[PDB]
Each structure stands twice: as structure tokens, then as C-alpha cells.
Design a protein around this ligand. Structure first.
Ligand SMILES: CCNC(=O)CSc1nnc(C(C)C)o1
Length: 330
């Protein structure tokens, strides 16, 4: 089997991408944030505290003839950005782009943190990191990818995120028309349960490539590119007037600037992020200070190849016995 679904930016900045997902019978379609940095499929639901729902579409398990309470199971997750959610668990039929999994754990939120309530466009998350990170207790549940893997034509999914445009998540096949050149594959560690790999270095603009190992994760659920402070300082030093602002929470730059590109290494291959992908616009409406798309990871504990980096590539998440990642230009 295969599946193919379009993913659409939630706003004009590509802050996140939503993909329609069919849950239950008859189908309830919710727009989920596919997140290769986490492993829970959770949704706003008829159980979510009413004051914490503000425009999201909800899953109502009582209206699904295939829903079953997973008795005793609870979940609770906290994300790197400080947001969180928790609740109980149903199993139900879940379909993405024509690919159907029966008995998928659908984690129904009883509580969500304010940032979720305040984003009416995201109805939940669909985790695509390894199932070792899933938070369901006392019986840890499998991700949609884990459950579908045996049925797929090939045990892969691909992320093809658009810049200010829709893109595609495919399951079970690699669309050879969706990229240019060749795909370069690189080794993955699932020891922390993330899609973890080592970039071979970077360049700023037209500058020389610096060969240096940068361990990080491929994370579709993170907007920006978070790299070591040395790398980030080298980038922003090429933008007149750019500076790190403790009050804003990262590097800002004059909105009048033209940003240089940023290249990262994948083995001997190179992925070029155009400068325009690094512009996240005014820090507040009307401001001439703009927020940068490359930020320091120093306070995180891990480097994160988020959407800024991934949308410059066609990315293969190969979930075979030896997990690898593939990157191609497009
Ligand atoms: C196909 C997705 N599989 C899982 O999420 C299982 S947990 C997991 N942790 N490491 C692995 C292997 C792929 C190395 O698997």
C-alpha cells in the first residue's frame, strides 16, 4: 500500500504545516501537524476542556462506530517549545492520503496548553519519530508509520515541504519526479528515539564550506533551524545590523536586509537554503526588526533541522532495520 497527502502552511510564514487525516467511521477529518520530532497522535476532542477549544475541529469518539476506549491508558506530553497536552486514548481507524491503519491509538486531549488553544488551525499532532518516544501509559503505543510499515510497498515516508506553498507527505514510495539530481542517504541513530543524523558542515552565502560534524534531528514539527552558536553567529555576521536580542528571544535583523543563503552538508552533497527562507518577518506588526530563521540551539541541548532546512529538500525517512535519512535538492 501507499498514501499521499498534501500538507499546507498554516500561515504566510510557514510556521507549521497541516495535513488532513481521516479518523473513525464515518470519517472525521482533522488537520494535523505531522511531527517527525515526536511519537504521539493526539487530537482535540469532545473530551477537551471546553475553555481550551477555540475554533479547532474536534474528534468525537462516540460518533465513530470503530472507536474503542483503550481502557486505563493515559498520555501526557511536553514539547521543546514549552507546550503540552494530555488525556486518554481510543483506538480507531486512521487514514492519511488513502493509506489506512486500523487499531491506531488516537490520543484524545482532555487538556491542552494555551499555545494549542490559540492556534485554531491545528487540530492535533501526528507523531512520526520512533514509537520508543510515545507517551501512552501503561502500554506504550505505536505511531501511524510504525503501524503502517509492514503494509507499505517500501518502509519509508517522505516529506516535501513547500516554501510559502503546499507540499506533500508520501508513505510507502519515493516519488522520483519530486526532486532533482540524486538522493544522498546518511546514517540515523534512534537511541534518543528521534530521527538523529550528522551533517557534514555548512557554508554561509557564497562562502567556503566548513567541514564539521553537526549532530541534529530532522524535525518537521519545529519551524526554525537551530544550530550551534558558532555556526549561527557566523551566519548572522553576514547580515548588516543583525544581532541577538535577549528580549525578543533570538537573532533579529533589519527587515530591509537581503539575507544570504545557508548551505548544509549531507555526506558529500549540499542542500542550499535560500536567504528568503530565513526571513520570519517583523517581530510584531509594523516593526522594522525581523525575526531570523536560523537560531542558536545552545539552550536546547540538541541541534534541530526544522522546517527552514527541511523545506529546502526532498527528505526520505527510511524506517528499515538500518533507519536512514535521504536528502535531495528539488
Ligand atoms: C518503522 C518505525 N519503527 C518504530 O517507530 C519502532 S521504534 C524504533 N526505534 N528504532 C527503530 C528501528 C527503525 C531502528 O525502531
Amino acid at each position: 500500500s501507499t498514501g499521499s497527502a498534501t500538507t499546507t502552511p498554516i500561515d504566510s510564514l510557514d510556521d507549521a504545516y497541516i495535513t488532513p487525516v481521516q479518523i473513525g467511521t464515518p470519517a472525521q477529518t482533522l488537520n494535523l501537524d505531522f511531527d517527525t520530532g515526536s511519537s504521539d497522535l493526539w487530537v482535540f476532542s469532545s473530551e477537551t476542556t471546553a475553555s481550551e477549544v477555540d475554533g479547532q475541529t474536534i474528534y468525537t469518539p462516540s460518533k465513530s462506530t470503530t472507536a474503542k476506549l483503550l481502557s486505563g491508558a493515559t498520555w501526557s506530553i511536553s514539547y521543546g517549545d514549552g507546550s503540552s497536552s494530555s488525556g486518554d486514548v481510543y483506538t480507531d481507524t486512521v487514514s492519511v492520503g488513502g493509506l489506512t491503519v486500523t487499531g491506531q491509538a488516537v490520543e484524545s486531549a482532555k487538556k491542552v496548553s494555551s499555545s494549542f488553544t490559540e492556534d485554531s488551525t491545528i487540530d492535533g499532532l501526528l507523531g512520526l519519530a520512533f514509537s520508543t518516544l510515545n507517551t501512552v501509559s501503561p502500554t506504550q503505543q505505536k505511531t501511524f508509520f510504525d503501524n503502517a510499515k509492514a503494509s507499505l510497498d517500501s518502509p519509508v515516508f517522505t516529506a516535501d515541504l513547500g516554501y510559502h506553498a503546499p507540499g506533500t507527505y508520501n508513505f510507502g514510495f519515493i516519488d522520483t519526479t519530486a526532486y532533482t539530481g540524486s538522493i544522498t542517504y546518511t546514517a540515523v541513530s534512534t537511541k534518543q528515539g528521534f530521527w538523529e543524523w550528522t551533517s557534514t558542515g555548512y557554508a554561509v552565502g557564497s562562502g567556503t564550506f566548513k567541514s564539521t560534524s553537526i549532530d541534529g534531528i530532522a524535525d518537521t514539527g519545529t519551524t526554525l533551524l537551530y544550530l550551534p552558536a558558532t555556526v549561527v553567529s557566523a551566519y548572522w555576521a553576514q547580515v548588516s545590523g543583525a544581532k541577538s536580542s535577549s528580549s525578543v528571544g533570538g537573532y533579529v535583523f533589519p527587515c530591509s536586509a537581503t539575507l544570504p543563503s545557508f548551505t548544509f552538508g549531507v555526506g558529500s552533497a549540499r542542500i542550499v537554503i535560500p536567504g528568503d527562507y530565513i526571513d520570519f518577518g517583523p517581530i510584531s506588526t509594523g516593526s522594522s526588526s525581523c525575526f531570523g530563521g536560523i537560531q542558536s540551539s545552545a539552550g536546547i541541548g540538541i541541534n534541530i533541522f526544522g522546517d527552514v532546512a527541511l523545506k529546502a529538500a526532498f527528505v526520505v525517512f527510511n524506517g528499515a532495520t538500518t533507519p536512514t535519512l535521504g536528502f535531495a535538492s528539488k
